[PDB]
Design a protein around this ligand. Sequence first.
Ligand SMILES: [Mg+2]
Ligand SMILES: [Mg+2]
Ligand SMILES: [Mg+2]
Ligand SMILES: [Mg+2]
Ligand SMILES: [Mg+2]
Ligand SMILES: [Mg+2]
Ligand SMILES: [Mg+2]
Ligand SMILES: [Mg+2]
Ligand SMILES: [Mg+2]
Ligand SMILES: [Mg+2]
Lengths: 53, 128, 109, 240, 125, 225, 63
Amino acid sequence: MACARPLISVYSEKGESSGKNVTLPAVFKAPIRPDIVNFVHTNLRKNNRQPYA
Amino acid sequence: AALRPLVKPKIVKKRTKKFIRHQSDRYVKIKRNWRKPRGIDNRVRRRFKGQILMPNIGYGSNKKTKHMLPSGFRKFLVHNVKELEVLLMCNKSYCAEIAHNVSSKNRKAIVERAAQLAIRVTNPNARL
Amino acid sequence: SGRLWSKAIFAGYKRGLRNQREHTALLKIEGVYARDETEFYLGKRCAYVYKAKNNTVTPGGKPNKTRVIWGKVTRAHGNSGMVRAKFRSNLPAKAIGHRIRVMLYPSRI
Amino acid sequence: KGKPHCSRNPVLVRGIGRYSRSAMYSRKAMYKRKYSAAKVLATVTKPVGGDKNGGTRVVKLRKMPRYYPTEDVPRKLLSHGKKPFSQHVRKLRASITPGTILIILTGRHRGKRVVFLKQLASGLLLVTGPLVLNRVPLRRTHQKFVIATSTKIDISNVKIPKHLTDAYFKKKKLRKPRHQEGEIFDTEKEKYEITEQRKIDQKAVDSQILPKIKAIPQLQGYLRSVFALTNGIYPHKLVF
Amino acid sequence: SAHLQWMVVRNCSSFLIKRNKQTYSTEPNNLKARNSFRYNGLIHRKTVGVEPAADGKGVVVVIKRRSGQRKPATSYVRTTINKNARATLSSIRHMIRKNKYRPDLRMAAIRRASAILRSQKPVMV
Amino acid sequence: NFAELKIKRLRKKFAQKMLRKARRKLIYEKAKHYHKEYRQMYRTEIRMARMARKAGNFYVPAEPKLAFVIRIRGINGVSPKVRKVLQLLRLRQIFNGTFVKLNKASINMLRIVEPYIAWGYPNLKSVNELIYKRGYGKINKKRIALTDNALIARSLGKYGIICMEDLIHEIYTVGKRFKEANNFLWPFKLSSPRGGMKKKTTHFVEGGDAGNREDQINRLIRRMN
Amino acid sequence: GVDIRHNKDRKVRRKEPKSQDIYLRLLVKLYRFLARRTNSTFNQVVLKRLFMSRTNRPPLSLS
RNA sequence: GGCGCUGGAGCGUCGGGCCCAUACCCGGCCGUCGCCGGCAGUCGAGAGUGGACGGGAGCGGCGGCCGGAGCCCCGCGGACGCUACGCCGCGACGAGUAGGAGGGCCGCUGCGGUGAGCCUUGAAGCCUAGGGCGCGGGCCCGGGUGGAGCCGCCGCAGGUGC
Ligand SMILES: [Mg+2]
Ligand SMILES: [Mg+2]
Ligand SMILES: [Mg+2]
Ligand SMILES: [Mg+2]
Ligand SMILES: [Mg+2]
Ligand SMILES: [Mg+2]
Ligand SMILES: [Mg+2]
Ligand SMILES: [Mg+2]
Ligand SMILES: [Mg+2]
Ligand SMILES: [Mg+2]
């Protein structure tokens, strides 16, 4: 699965397939890590904060 | 008449009264909500005879009959019709309560759908 | 036509000096003043019959004021003809010194 | 197959036979009775009839359920006992023998003295304190709720009718067919009717019990009287 | 994979309802509507679901095809069964058992179809 | 291969049934032999005493090699040495009983914990009642009731003890594997003595209950369980 | 009352990884099954090492 | 201790009965701990403490002394389960200040997501001899008042519980 990269059809503006295919980028087979995503999201949502006192 | 649960075991309650807070009878400022006494000389905390009883894990209900209503069903809160079909396969053991803030016209539809699905409602006539 | 039950007095609850076990009662059956004479009354049904304000249904009769707490004698108490009794509900404390009927119903003779 | 035999191991104490394993082996002659070596149609075929409907139909019995409940209850374990009430052994107190005068303790015949005839299949006693004496018909009673006195009459060689059984004395009811909701009172038939068969049986039994009652003095007066507790007498000191 | 997606969504899901010491899952293809790996209707390569028909008669049995796993538009095949109750249960039993298509959901699907048909039949008086 | 596998399973089940039958016959005959041994010992003591009395001498019986020890005092305010010896005797609760093989070391331990225990010399009936009514095994550190002989066999069969009768024999006649057989038994959790005690705070020879009562421990056991 | 001491009743040990790594939890499931259903003590050792913390799983150098 | 007690309800030596602690025994239920216990076998055909083959030479019970192939099907069928952070089994255990730790589907406020959430056919708040649930913190529902907003779940953050 991880080493297997299928072909995804590019859909035209009319919604149907245009006949063009793109190999699945390898980033879509990267490990799915909800704990790391939650950690990074938690620590980066604080960076836009505006101070109060 | 009323829909019946799958099984109706005898529900045994170890204690039926409430654990009132120590000295909640003597003061209005002290609500009856249980608070563990932590005074150094507290006789209720020290468990002297004839005093207010303290809650502990030994009063826990049987796990088979825990959270069971007197009808034998177990309660589940629903806010609309969509949250009612989750009980379609739990029909014989769980009954639905319509939430308190649901409007009359919506809870009429909820009651009708529950009657269709043979789901018991504990407040079927609540806004009419 | 006849009394058909033995008279007894609700003497009190099973108790120590400073602890009271209300789930069982002590009965003094009239004419039974030794422990060896109590064997007849073991297992016999006993009834605390009283009256109240509201009418209640009577089995085989019209509703009336009569109410009963049923029980039975379990074992002998002491050496002087006391017996212990278990009732369906714990006897009210106002019944101390009042009549209990021992009904002869589960006869072994 | 062969004819069934008696147990050949007499019981001396319940659960223990009188003879040992080898003794019963020799008694059974197992030394020569040695052996080494030598359904129901679920579906039925029926001619359906009619032209070009095929030959026949293979119709199965016990079709599969139309409906399944949302959830079921698991089956119980096995108890290796707990026989039904009809198969229970019936025990009778040794003081209750046929002809004994009993005292009824419960019911509308409370305190009356009746005559015991026989224990029935359910263990209930059949009594008739003769109806001419104390208005107690042929009637069932429970041995737990009677007092067996010491006075007895010899009711041997009298004929208790065979049909006098538990099914005979079982109560009958009318309600409630063809009626679901009560808007018109169904209090009819509430007057129980004494059957002519019951009257005939009562006469037949009493006609042969009464002469034996009159055979001893003032037993009829004893049976007419009812039992009571005087303030001086105590049931544990009373010999019955 | 099914197990990995389950580890992702076992506690964080929009279909997850946690109330009254109970838990439920409201995804479309969940028989028994319970939050569980076996009955989840999204994470498995093959799934079966039973729904009421658009009109209040019959059932719709939907099964997930094998090929288009990443193509949700054509991933599900729906058939409508509007026969008697026994025939409908037989059809569902044959679709699950004869095809060997998730045989562990056979009685769940049969019971759900029975519930739907009983709800669809007219009430009594 | 269906017929062949049916034959295989039938042969396996039949072999298992024959093995169970052989083991049951062995258990029966071992119990019979133990009965013979018990009556031989009981009659032998009487015969020896009789011949000594006939000769005009005295027959001193062998000093008892088995004791039953019952802890009679509670767990409050116990000195450290008494506490340690009670733990070594496995009497951590009041009215707990344990069989003790008697020798110099064990007797001196009993002397140490003398005020806290009542002990004596159990007889065959006492051993039988204790093992049968209150016998529990320490199987995988669990208190398991001795409801089957397989429970004893799986834990003590390497020592030759395979049944209730073998266990009772090893306890009564203190055998080679008495330590293993006794430690296999969970300490007996006896009830309160029905009819009460005389005085738990003093020795038996001064009208109380503590200490060594020679063979009145059997009376105590009868009232105790 | 029983004369025992309760201060050592609860054995302090890892029964599961404190980590929330889902891949680690999946392979902990795999080795839990293998350690339960096999007599290989290797699987038991590997499972208890999977439970461990990072300081208890030091890196191993190539040398 | 009081009333009282003197053929004792006093003193000394003893017997038999009897009374009851949260102690002991048996049983039920709750939790904790232990078995780093069992369950991926949902395997109604799985069948497992060895099977496979493949020819040696042999018996044993049936197919007139030569003899041998078995595949489920008159039924097409067969409860529940396994949020594996789940479920199940067995055993022992349960005092607690100062203090430590764990769990909290206990509670308050705000933020990111989510509930095709709730709501003028009535939100919040408040009142209530109303019905209940939980050991508990607390919570749900009915009735009234009120008149415009509010809540569940997954995370995040505190000026968070008298
Ligand atoms: Mg409560
Ligand atoms: Mg107050
Ligand atoms: Mg203090
Ligand atoms: Mg002391
Ligand atoms: Mg006694
Ligand atoms: Mg002292
Ligand atoms: Mg304890
Ligand atoms: Mg402690
Ligand atoms: Mg504690
Ligand atoms: Mg503050």
